[PDB]
Structures are given as structure tokens and as C-alpha cells.
Design a protein around this nucleic acid. Structure first.
Ligand SMILES: O=P(O)(O)O[C@H]1[C@H](OP(=O)(O)O)[C@@H](OP(=O)(O)O)[C@H](OP(=O)(O)O)[C@@H](OP(=O)(O)O)[C@H]1OP(=O)(O)O
Ligand SMILES: [Cl-]
Length: 183
DNA sequence: TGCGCTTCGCGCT
């Protein structure tokens, strides 16, 4: 019901040029594997040192609203994240997501990242930790960009229009993420 | 608040 401005989407999910914030689109489906129950998007709480606030990453904001999703513990769910920056360890979700997957075995998590957030020195260990805890960790391709536009954006009937370099950036980042997860 | 560049801000205003 709450949809994203087209400009916000294309300025934040471009897999070639970064932004100083993170958006996260999310979908919950009930598993004989077909039921689409809760959808939305959110961004990080910006760091604001004038109020002495060190910020809250978008993935941690997703964990904050899980209670409000009212997932029935008698059902199995798949949670999908479309995140403009890969999750990280430092000030990140990696540890709390690991904890959240350990204590909630009825939840499967799938994470598609537009870009790799390597500004965290431990970003490799973060991605490896999420995989160890049974999360699927992937790079957004054309299919994921288009699904996100079709589902989360106020497109007003305008079909998704790929930016220049979309497939090239996707392949390069897929290469990097595979070398990280090979280890 | 808005700007200009843009790695979950910064450093001006
Ligand atoms: O593959 P189909 O079962 O024939 O239906 C697909 C499929 O629908 P859903 O995403 O709703 O399940 C696409 O996504 P995939 O499952 O193939 O990944 C979807 O694309 P969007 O999610 O981007 O909307 C696309 O929708 P459309 O063509 O109406 O834009 C639609 O049709 P196509 O397979 O003909 O592309
Ligand atoms: Cl994170």
C-alpha cells in the first residue's frame, strides 16, 4: 500500500553508483510454498552526531518491525530482502540476523544486494556468517530490479527501464560475492 | 532547511 517514489528507487538501487543511505524492500511468503502476506520498504535511520546518535542500519530496522508482521509460529515463511547495500558486521545486522535465524527455524531468509558494502572491513565475514546461518546471499540481477520496480514503486504503469551497465555491474559483483562465499 | 557529491554522510549553510 505504501509505494516508493520512482526517483528514490533509481537513485538508490543503481548497481554502479552508491548513496550515503540504504533502502530495503521486503516480502514475506508462507510455505505448499505460495502465499504473499507482507510487503514494504524502509531506509536506515541516518547517523546524527548533533543528537549523539550513531544511526541504525536498514537491516536492523527490518528486525525491529518483525513482531508487527505477526508471523504465525505454526507456519513456515520465506523472507526476501532487496537491499541497496549488502549487509555488514560493524554497526551491522550480521550478528543479530544470525541470532534471529537460530531462534526462529520457521523463517528462511533470501538477501539480494544491489551493491557490495565493502566500507566495513569485516564485510566478507558478515556475508559468510549470513550464509552459515542458512540465509541465501545473492546479487540483484535484471529480474530482481524489475520485480522490485513492478512491486514496490509508484510507477503509474511505466515499465522498468534498465540503466546503462546494469548486466555488467551485476556480473562483476556476482564474481566478487562467489569468491567470498567459496571460502 | 537545502546543497553538492554520493560506501547505512559530511560539512558547509
Ligand atoms: O514467470 P511467470 O510465472 O510466467 O510470470 C512472470 C513472473 O511473475 P511473478 O514475479 O509475479 O511470480 C515474473 O517474475 P518471476 O517469477 O518469473 O521471477 C514477473 O515479473 P515481476 O515480478 O517483475 O512483475 C512477470 O511479470 P510481468 O511480465 O507481468 O511484468 C511474470 O510474467 P513473465 O514471465 O511473462 O515475465
Ligand atoms: Cl547491515
Amino acid at each position: 500500500r505504501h509505494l516508493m517514489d520512482p526517483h528514490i528507487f533509481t537513485s538508490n538501487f543503481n548497481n554502479g553508483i552508491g548513496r550515503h543511505k540504504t533502502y530495503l524492500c521486503y516480502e514475506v511468503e508462507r510455505l505448499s510454498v505460495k502465499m504473499d502476506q507482507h510487503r514494504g520498504f524502509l531506509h536506515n535511520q541516518a547517523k546524527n552526531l548533533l543528537c549523539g546518535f550513531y544511526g541504525r542500519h536498514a537491516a536492523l530496522r527490518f528486525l525491529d518491525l518483525v513482531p508487527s508482521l505477526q508471523l504465525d509460529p505454526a507456519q513456515i515463511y520465506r523472507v526476501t530482502w532487496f537491499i541497496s547495500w549488502s549487509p555488514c558486521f560493524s554497526w551491522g545486522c550480521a550478528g543479530e540476523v544470525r541470532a534471529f535465524l537460530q531462534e526462529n527455524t520457521h523463517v528462511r531468509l533470501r538477501i539480494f544486494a544491489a551493491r557490495i558494502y565493502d566500507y566495513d572491513p569485516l564485510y566478507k565475514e558478515a556475508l559468510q556468517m549470513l550464509r552459515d546461518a542458512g540465509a541465501q546471499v545473492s546479487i540483484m540481477t535484471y529480474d530482481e530490479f524489475k520485480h522490485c520496480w513492478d512491486t514496490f514503486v509508484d510507477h503509474q504503469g511505466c515499465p522498468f527501464q534498465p540503466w546503462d551497465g546494469l548486466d555488467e555491474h551485476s556480473q562483476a559483483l556476482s564474481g566478487r560475492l562467489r569468491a567470498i562465499l567459496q571460502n
